[PDB]
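Hey, sorry for the delay on this. The queue was backed up all week. Below are the sequences that define the complex (chains, strands and the ligand SMILES where applicable).
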Amino acid sequence: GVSSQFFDAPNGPSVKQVLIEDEWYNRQRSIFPLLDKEPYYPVDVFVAPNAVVCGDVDIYGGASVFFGAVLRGDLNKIRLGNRSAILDRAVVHAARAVPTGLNAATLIGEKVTVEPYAVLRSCRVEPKVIIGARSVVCEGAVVESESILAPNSVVPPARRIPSGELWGGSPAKFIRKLTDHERDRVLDDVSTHYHNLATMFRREALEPGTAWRDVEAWRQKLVDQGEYEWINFREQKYLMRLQHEAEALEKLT
Amino acid sequence: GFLDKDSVTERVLHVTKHFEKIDASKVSPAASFEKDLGLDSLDVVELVMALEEEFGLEIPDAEADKIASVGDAINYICSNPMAK
Amino acid sequence: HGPAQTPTVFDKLVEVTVVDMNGIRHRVRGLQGQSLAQALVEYGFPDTYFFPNMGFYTQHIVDAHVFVPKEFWGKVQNVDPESDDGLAVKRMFRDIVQDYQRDTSFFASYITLGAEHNGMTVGIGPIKPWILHSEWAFAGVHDSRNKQFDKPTVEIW
Amino acid sequence: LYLSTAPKLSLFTFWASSWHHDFSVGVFILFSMFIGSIGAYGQPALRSLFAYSTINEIGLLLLAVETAGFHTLYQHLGIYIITQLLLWNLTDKRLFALCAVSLAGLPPFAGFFGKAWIFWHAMSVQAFSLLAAALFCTLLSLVYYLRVIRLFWTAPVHTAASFTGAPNQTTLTSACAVALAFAPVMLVKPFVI
Amino acid sequence: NPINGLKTILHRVGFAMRESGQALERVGCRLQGVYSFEEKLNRHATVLPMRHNVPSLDKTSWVAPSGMVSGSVTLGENSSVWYGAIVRGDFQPVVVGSNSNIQDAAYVGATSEFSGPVTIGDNVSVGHGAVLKGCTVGDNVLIGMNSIISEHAEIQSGAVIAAGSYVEEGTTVPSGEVWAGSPAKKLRDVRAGEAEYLKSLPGRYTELAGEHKGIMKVLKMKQAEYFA
Amino acid sequence: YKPEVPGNTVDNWTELRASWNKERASSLGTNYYLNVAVMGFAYWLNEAYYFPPRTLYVGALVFFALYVRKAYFSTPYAFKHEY
Amino acid sequence: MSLFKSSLPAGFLFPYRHPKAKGLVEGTLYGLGSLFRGVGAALDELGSMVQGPQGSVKDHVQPNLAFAPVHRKPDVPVNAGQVVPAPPAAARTLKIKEVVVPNKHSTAFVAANANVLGNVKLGAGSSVWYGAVLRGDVNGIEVGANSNIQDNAIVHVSKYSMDGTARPTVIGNNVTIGHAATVHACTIEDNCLVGMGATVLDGATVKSGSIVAAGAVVPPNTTIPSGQVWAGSPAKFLRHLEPEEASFIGKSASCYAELSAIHKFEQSKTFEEQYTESCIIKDRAALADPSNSVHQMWEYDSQTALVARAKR
Amino acid sequence: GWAYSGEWGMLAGFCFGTLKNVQEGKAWFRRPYIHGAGMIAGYYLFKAAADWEDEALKRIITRYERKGYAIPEDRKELFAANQYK
Ligand SMILES: C/C=C/C(=O)SCCNC(=O)CCNC(=O)[C@@H](O)C(C)(C)COP(=O)(O)OP(=O)(O)OC[C@H]1O[C@@H](n2cnc3c(N)ncnc32)[C@H](O)[C@@H]1OP(=O)(O)O
Ligand SMILES: CCCCCCCCCCCC(=O)SCCNC(=O)CCNC(=O)[C@H](O)C(C)(C)COP(=O)(O)O
């Protein structure tokens, strides 16, 4: 078993831990750090309110994370390229190591679209790639630039899809070659279309909105009743560190 | 391949020549330290230190422990990117 | 087209042995078509080993000073010394390397990894202190655990 | 940013207010314009590019001083100072192209007007040789300002968000100084005299 | 469409008034010394309009709180959108008939650049995790779990799509046939005992949606006890 | 189609390496000597502004023709052990 | 006891909510703030009216569906969840006497946006991840100790089937359920792995120490024996287990125990702690300037940005 | 000074607000109170510039006439005028 308290967290130990069954409203953040691993994102990113971006994640340019998608950078790094789209409820994960011996981070190039319910884990996707829906690209696999994966396809670990082609199946086999106009324009067209849809969502978002008014009304009612507790969190973190150091010193000798 | 395979070989023979417990004519370009030349570990360490003195390097304990032959020493010096 | 082999990553893998400036040998894996400086960055080498390519329109490319054996001298890509790329290499030799230069000195972005590099041993060469701007410099001492790979951007400004 | 704006204003105001000399500064005009233009053409680092382009601009200001007529000096210096305030506080790199087109003297933007009254007053008092050198160096300056435009306009846009607060903290000043495209309506009139 | 022009002008003016009001309320909160507006709570919306395009939900239809409908979505009588399901009509509209179920974490949408509207008929079962992009589904069809139906495909009435299948773009699936495979192909005809369970499937989901809607009402009243 | 790079890679790279195997001097000496030259001897040009323009133009062309470029400068004297 | 534990102002100690105003100036500011809040909410409501029917959709907080009840049914026995008494408001309004909530062990981790409903049992050290759906409504769902259901995976059971069998879903110990996997009315034994994006259909049995590969579809009423790997759509026999993959299964289970610890640590912090931590991050970035004028007198604590001691 | 300087200042304020939005990744219409404040500041700034136009003309004619340059009365109205051109 592993304890759920961390005394070497960058902002200190957690003073008050809340059980999930005691929560009366949903408090899931969409962008949050895991100890010392903070996500990196641009000013014009679209992160959907029910999408999760956590840990060591780098986002560039005009990339977008659509509804219910997960980008979990807890075992390694994940990079999302310029104007790359992660569509609805697709999962991007990363392993600590790969059988090929290369870097195990999931690297996604620019202008890459990932269709709904697809899974990327410790793979390399080069620029201008369409991953189809219900597709899995396994650990250490490589998808080369200007290539298309058909929906419901499996790319097994440490396998390669050559550039300029359409592949599909379980396991993925050769279907056909892309035309020159498809490599020149169509992949950029799909990425630009999904960026335009993300911009339409970004224009209409009122952040932070007004859902906090009810929670603040409940807190005001607690201050009215005298049941709201004021906690000095900085001082409690300091005192907990001092007690931890004293307890560690009072066992070695 | 950072350096040639002839001048390093004769320099190896030149520093192998001045050893009192070695034979000045038994030394071959491809021999062994244990079966052929008859050296224990400390003699091997002394020879590797002489080679380090001549070529201006630093060979760690594990790398010098792997070296067991004249050809092994020549190949290690040739593969070293910081040789002189 | 028939029952021929499915493409694997192992078909395109290139292995290079790299000796850093402390003499420690490292196993570096790369892919065909990737430059050497990129494979060195992705291996996890510290950021003090790398410096900007000092040409116009290419300072976003990171580069390293490598020592290449005589067998692999002819597999470094050719640069015209009269062109503007030649003057970029001349500026890099003039300012970054200086008197650490040897006859095996090259730059790692000018090495494109292929099957001919498989088994090649290179070493990292030392460099002089340099500055591009306030957010990218090198004071002269390789005492830092920060990897180059962990930098999110390469900033020319 | 501090070094390119305030001391030049202070010293040129002392020169305008209380200084007379019986000599010339023409060889230093030639040296500044040719050295600054050729140096900024030849130096790939951006900091050195802007240092040499500053030497070229101070050569133009010296041409305005040498032919008298301090009104053109003050107009060009003000436009230059506003451009400097935009240049060193940029976080979006697309506006780096506006600094480029307004430091190259391209017509509708305010840098054109600041250069062009200096050229007009130089032609008025018939300072022909220094003017010809200034026009040649102006033709050279366009090439590296186009290099700036190639670097930062014809490129994909990436601007990192803030994490520890202070979100893009000088967008007010940079967006206010980009409206040097609206000052030319007041610059064409007899304004700075 | 000048009607859309007037709606556009009104929506933009009202949006500007809303931004100004919320900003003034945040200034008031800062003056009070209360910083509850800075909380990074979940801002998920079950119903998400796209400017003047509001989803049209029947009073006997139900959308689960973790589900969502966006843009031009029509839900018919006693039709259900379950937990985690995403039905997207912000680019091209979605039309769902009556007594049809979109099960847990299923994606139905028309968001591709050349996709037509999605039309789902009456008594349609859309299984768990199925992805529907710009298709037309007839009456009394089971969409199997983790299946993909592509753009301009026609799933005619009475057909069964098996689990994990992928129907290609512009593919017509005939009536009363079972199709399976990732290059999906006809496997057999629907049998009678199979068709009995096909007929009895959507009513169960109707009553299950009723029970879950009641429990969600209980949860909302529990939530409302805190702040009211 | 792409043009071929002229020459040999080993010979070209040896040409690129040439005359740079030396520690670069600091710039303080060049800057101090420039300031000394201007502050001590630029007054010699005071009467030159009144000279005929053919003389001034030919002198400017002569200075341009005899100028040696500071960037990529090298001497054979840097690598010899006696004069 | 940092250095100024008895002299810091209350605004610095409580950045999320300042205490009660005392003087004339603070009360005037508080009254102005309440007036601004009223006028701002009024302008927001008026703008929503002018906007049209889209303004009638309002911003509301979402319910906690990570721990959610279902209807207690008379034909459905409760063996995974627990029957708890109904709330009195629900009883007096819409006729509820008993609901079924999940049985959740204290060391398990559930994501705040996951959907775990009703007749579900969660073992010790087990984890349900972001966007996962565990709907136990018509039968029971059992998850063993140190088991993980990963992101966007769907778990469901059947009461009525084609062949008239009610089947629960039972998941054993040290089981890894892959990303976007579909688990439907089936049995997974101890120390098994289901690949990411795979589908296991009704009444299929995965015996102990086996692996279902990524993208595989397990047909109904299929038994996958021990020490075999199955793959494809439909899944057939592919290989026997390697010596290393059996230890890899346990490595995966231990890795997700370690990961669920960190994610539970980050998730279960209150709003006040998170706001204090953001203020601390701000102070730390202000202290990262080496020319900061306090660096010559005070030494600051790294984790809280408080003055620890005098430097000189 | 110029008659349409305030309208030019308002267009300047609108473009200022739009650019402040575009720099920070927001659409052009976002935060319209920033546009309004920019419009007010641009209006008053360009009205002040138009006032300096008349002031500069008045200073030039006054200094030139004190030095001895006698301007005829048909041309003094080109300078000593708050002309709203
Ligand atoms: C986030 C948490 C992650 C975890 O901890 S595990 C959850 C996710 N893990 C997985 O991806 C599990 C699945 N991974 C694997 O591929 C594996 O287990 C899979 C083991 C059976 C096999 O993966 P391998 O890398 O061992 O591939 P094999 O050498 O076994 O491949 C043999 C054969 O099977 C085929 N094969 C291999 N893998 C697959 C797949 N997946 N699908 C279909 N067909 C396949 C393939 O075609 C091969 O033939 P050819 O390519 O024609 O020569
Ligand atoms: C400045 C001068 C100061 C010097 C002071 C330091 C002097 C330290 C001397 C004392 C240290 C020892 O003797 S240490 C004691 C060394 N003797 C043993 O360990 C017993 C086993 N015999 C061996 O190890 C032999 O070396 C051998 C059989 C050749 C093994 O052959 P290899 O070798 O092939 O392995």
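The first strand of chain E starts at residue 47 and ends at 48.

I'll add it to the shared folder too.

S.
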